[PDB]
Amino acid sequence: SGFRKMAFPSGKVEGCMVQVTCGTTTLNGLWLDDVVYCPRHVICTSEDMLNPNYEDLLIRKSNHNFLVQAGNVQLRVIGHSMQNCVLKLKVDTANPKTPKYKFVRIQPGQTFSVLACYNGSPSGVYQCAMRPNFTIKGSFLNGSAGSVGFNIDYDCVSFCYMHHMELPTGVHAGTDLEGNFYGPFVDRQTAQAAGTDTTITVNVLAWLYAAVINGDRWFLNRFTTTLNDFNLVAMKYNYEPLTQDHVDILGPLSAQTGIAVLDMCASLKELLQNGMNGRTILGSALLEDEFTPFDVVRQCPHT
Amino acid sequence: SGFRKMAFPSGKVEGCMVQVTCGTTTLNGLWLDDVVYCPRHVICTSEDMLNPNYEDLLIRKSNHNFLVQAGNVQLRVIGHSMQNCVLKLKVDTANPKTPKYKFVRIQPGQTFSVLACYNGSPSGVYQCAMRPNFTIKGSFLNGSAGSVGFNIDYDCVSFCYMHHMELPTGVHAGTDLEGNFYGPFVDRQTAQAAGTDTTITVNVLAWLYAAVINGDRWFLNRFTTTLNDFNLVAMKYNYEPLTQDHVDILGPLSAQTGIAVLDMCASLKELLQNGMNGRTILGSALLEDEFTPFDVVRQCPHT
């Protein structure tokens, strides 16, 4: 038993982590085949990061203005090209450690592992959710731009995130690996703020099921509710509407436990209106919403 | 900015996991140099599990009863020996991915990263603290025995935990990498109970400083206390006595914050007596203790 925020093993990402230096800006790049992906702000000087002309600053850069470094191996930079808000540095060496990979764009609600990295050195891995407002609540320090988020399914790494910047509120923002930002953010120094956040109801329901599957059942009650009666309580406490597809998605989990989706809603609704009265669920005093239904199933096979 | 439970990059350990099968039991082994380490109860079998005699069981075993598999390469067993609660299988192949490693017995309150494996294939990685009663609160299912737990320091993997079993209360237990169980536990399927847990005081303070570094400061005050005066309140709330050594350990986090350790003790005695009163600390409604002082420094370097 047990249930922990768990991240995929990072070994396959670790051998793609490299370090990129243009002038005195240093960050991390991703090394796939003979291309190295890095935030395009590595080309910006600390005096040019307010409203920068990226198309203009890149041309000036020659290849030798880019220092790429995988561990202590130097990589020749043979070409440079703009991939939206990221940069594709062509190198002379294909990464001998390139994993089977794909780039996918996640939707809000979905989760992924993050491999915190600094100066091309990975430092730690942990599990994040793409919030409804397209930020993520991670732990990135200065120079961690270029750390990536990935899901690993069987053997194929799906890269879904590349960290770019911190919002003035402490949350983080980045692009997919095709260089397109998540949400309404730009890679300039403006007064961007995260949209107002909301809780991801399906993930809480999923995690409630994970609690039941592990023998935490004190919150279960005899009431039941209509989707719409629930969703109006959901609106009140800043929670996303639950849709029929969510209820479909919660199907498998509802059958492994034999607790109707709408019966669990009745528990969640009680918990939002009255609180937990000093109890905890799966070790937490708060409702956790960064576990997808698929994530619950990984640690709780039906068997 | 940001602060989240963070596992070490697991890539150096992934390369050591193998699957070990004896008879009809399968679980994970640790392939270092020319030896595979796994739990000794792989040689257990149905006939007797409440009082298996392991000398008798091992004596009924030859080298070719142990099947070792590393990816898609079968290792052949050259010799087998028993060391406390752990098996060492000599294989004909040295692991060409063996990291720089050491075997350490962690002390109660210390933390390590677990790399859950099933069938010698890693599955995920997360942070875990050896509870003062020598159990860990992990996420483990049948067949994950042999999953190890480690710290990483300058590319040296300090192995500290190997998973063996789950107690009736749902917490887990295992040996160090020398086969000696953390705690008063035996590797029998008999009902065994851990002592009463306690909260790890010095870890909690280390969390509180991590909250201050991240801008949650609402719990501070100007009061102060004594080690002796504070340790009284710790006893009432089932906290571990705090020692001068803990105060010295927190030294580096006190400098980074400007809050003397005993001023932070005053802060924490206030939290125990009057609850968090609806607020949260680093997005938690409870006091966390699975964060070592060093673990905070790691995620929040100062200068």
Numbering used by the authors:
A (entry chain A), B (entry chain B): 1 to 303
Q: What did the authors write?
A:
The main protease of SARS-CoV-2 (Mpro, also referred to as 3-chymotrypsin-like protease or 3CLpro) is responsible for the majority of nsp processing, cleaving at 11 conserved sites along the polyprotein including self-excision of Mpro by autolytic cleavage of its own N-terminal and C-terminal autoprocessing sites. SARS-CoV-2 Mpro is a functional homodimer of two symmetrically disposed protomers that are each 306 residues in length (33.8 kDa). The active site of Mpro features a Cys145-His41 catalytic dyad, which orchestrates nucleophilic attack at the carbonyl carbon of the invariant P1 glutamine and the formation of an acyl enzyme intermediate central to efficient peptide cleavage. Using C-terminally substituted Mpro chimeras, we have determined X-ray crystallographic structures of Mpro in complex with 10 of its 11 viral cleavage sites, bound at full occupancy intermolecularly in trans, within the active site of either the native enzyme and/or a catalytic mutant (C145A).
